[PDB]
């Protein structure tokens, strides 16, 4: 959006035309509206208390009360409220989306479910409206939850694969930084983790094995290759002219 | 929910903590017509009765005898023998009464009242103070003789 | 007076009169016969204090133990003693209560050390205390295996 | 959980064994979101 | 694999208070052969084994 169309260089303006034309192609394969992908791809989250994220407030807030910070641990406290307002099956999927909430730092403020949880555990008390200092900073919060949900849903990934993004960002090729390295909800890294969904979707049957052979650094040509029914000196060859 | 709450202060009076609260609000949830209060409520009686069972410990129970004529005679210089004084006050028919702040022994209307103040037993002197043994003291019974 | 598990010593206030568990002997009284048993648990000691007791006079005394009560719930390694005529520390004995009585477990075997003190053994408890003879235990065990 | 530990307890301190135990983990099963403990937890109430 | 350490995890928990001498391993581990295995029968646990 910064760039201008006045002064560009030609090489540069076919780049840009390129990745448009690799948007455009990837959403007509995806089959998605243009409102679609920059709802799940915006940054701008709006500040308005809903009646409806009011009462996940509220049963939050009635639900983790009488909680003890060294007892347990919060995340997986919260957890099953995550999992029902946003309509999750798992638990762990729940798990996945608030250690992804960690790790985008998300808006405004320097933010944390820490933070979230000393917000409701200092200054909350429910069923009366008085504005607070962090309570936008919570409610995009709640919505960048709400959007990060819907590329998990749109996507169709399994969900061991999404342990291991979320885990290991920089061996699906972001540059690395231990457990910094954050992918965005920007769309250079959603058409590659849809690209990734389709091959696991691709293989089939015996996905497990390959995943978590993959998950190990042992995985090999030959059982990849069996996966795919293909020769697997047709992939020794090709390995050897990429090197 | 009234139940609930008078066996909430029954185990305020039990064990000594009036700020304990396990009853909170939020069971009752109207915008979904109050479907699912017993589990609410189920939870929360639990969690009281396993407070009440980590609570719970072996009392030391000890008796003692008090005898009023050792309190009244035992007291200040302001003192007195408690038959003669009770047979004179009852005797004569004037205003007189013996004892003090605590121990007054008072002649109203028709009755006669020996009233006694807890201080003046020094009961929890008994024993030394002594924190292994405890500092909670609450009565068990009064008896008469 | 005494010795390693049997000196009564005088310390602050009170007086201590202790004992070891070995000195009672207490599993030779049979012949071992492991037909009948091996293990061997209180179930309940109770106190005796022969004396002529004030009428209406009660004495102040407590039972402590040694063996840190690391099977024993909270609080039963202590005993209370009021009037001391085959009492427990309760005020009626049940032994149809669920809970546990105080020493209910105890190895006849040295496991620790046995302790009676007498607080105020200045002159608060100085008559009945000139005035007492000797002590008695009700030991009540068990025995099978 | 806890109250049926008590009551192991309770079992370890009436008969003299301490190292017996009945209570064994894993009859939680999160991955399952902690479907039939009652089933478990009642067996073993049983065996005690 | 993670299925695969699930059958381990689950016969591992419920085959555990077992003796040798009580009762048949095969009968004891039957049925989470046939449950992981998805087999209708226990007799096809028992023949399979």
């Not at chain 3, 105080?102 to 105020?120: A, M, Q, Y």
Request: negative net charge; proline residues 4%; contains cysteine.
């Amino acid at each position: 959006d910064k760039i201008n169309l006045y002064d560009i260089d030609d090489k540069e303006l076919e780049k840009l035309i390129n990745r448009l034309d690799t948007l455009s192609n990837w959403l007509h394969t995806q089959k998605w509206s243009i409102y679609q992908l920059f709802l799940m791809t915006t940054t701008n989250y709006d500040k308005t208390l809903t009646p409806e994220i009011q009462n996940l407030l509220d049963t939050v807030y009635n639900g983790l009360q009488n909680f003890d910070k060294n007892k347990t641990k919060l995340l997986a406290a919260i957890a099953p409220y995550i999992a029902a307002t946003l309509q999750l099956p798992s638990e762990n999927v729940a798990h996945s989306i608030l250690l992804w909430a960690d790790k985008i730092k998300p808006s405004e403020n320097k933010i944390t479910a820490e933070k979230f949880w000393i917000w409701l555990q200092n200054r909350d008390t429910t069923e009366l409206s008085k504005p607070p200092e962090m309570q936008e900073q919570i409610i995009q919060y709640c919505h960048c939850l709400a959007q990060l949900t819907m590329i998990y849903r749109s996507s169709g990934i399994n969900e061991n694969a999404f342990r291991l993004f979320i885990e290991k960002p920089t061996i699906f090729g972001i540059p690395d930084e231990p457990n910094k390295a954050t992918p965005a909800h920007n769309a250079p890294t959603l058409i590659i983790l849809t690209r990734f969904a389709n091959w696991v979707n691709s293989l089939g049957e015996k996905a497990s094995p390959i995943l978590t052979a993959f998950e190990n650094k042992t995985l090999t040509a030959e059982k990849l290759a069996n996966a795919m029914n293909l020769d697997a000196n047709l992939l020794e060859q090709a390995s050897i002219q990429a090197q | 929910v009234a139940r609930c709450l008078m066996a909430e202060q029954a185990y305020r009076w039990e064990t000594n903590d009036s700020s304990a609260r396990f009853i909170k609000p939020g069971a009752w949830q109207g915008t979904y017509a109050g479907l699912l209060a017993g589990e609410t409520l189920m939870l929360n009686l639990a969690q009281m009765e396993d407070a009440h069972l980590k609570q719970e410990q072996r009392a030391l129970e000890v008796e003692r005898t008090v005898s009023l004529a050792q309190v009244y005679q035992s007291l200040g210089e302001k003192s007195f023998a408690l038959k003669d004084k009770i047979e004179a006050l009852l005797q004569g028919d004037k205003e007189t009464s013996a004892g003090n702040d605590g121990n007054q022994l008072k002649l109203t209307n028709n009755t006669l009242s020996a009233t006694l103040t807890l201080q003046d037993l020094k009961l929890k002197d008994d024993y030394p103070e002594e924190m292994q043994l405890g500092k909670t003291r609450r009565i068990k019974q009064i008896s008469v003789s | 007076a005494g010795n390693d598990g049997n000196q009564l010593k005088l310390t602050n206030n009170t007086l201590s009169a202790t004992l070891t568990l070995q000195d009672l002997k207490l599993k030779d009284d049979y012949p071992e016969e492991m037909q009948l048993g091996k293990t061997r648990r209180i179930k309940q000691i109770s106190v005796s204090l022969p004396a002529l007791l004030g009428p209406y006079q009660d004495v102040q005394a407590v039972l402590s133990y040694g063996g840190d009560a690391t099977g024993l719930a909270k609080g039963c390694k202590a005993l209370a003693v009021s009037h001391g005529l085959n009492d427990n520390g309760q005020f009626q004995l049940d032994f149809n209560d669920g809970k546990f009585l105080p020493f209910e477990g105890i190895d006849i075997n040295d496991k620790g050390t046995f302790t009676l003190s007498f607080p105020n053994a200045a002159s608060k408890q100085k008559n009945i205390l000139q005035m007492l003879t000797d002590i008695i235990l009700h030991i009540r065990y068990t025995i099978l295996e």
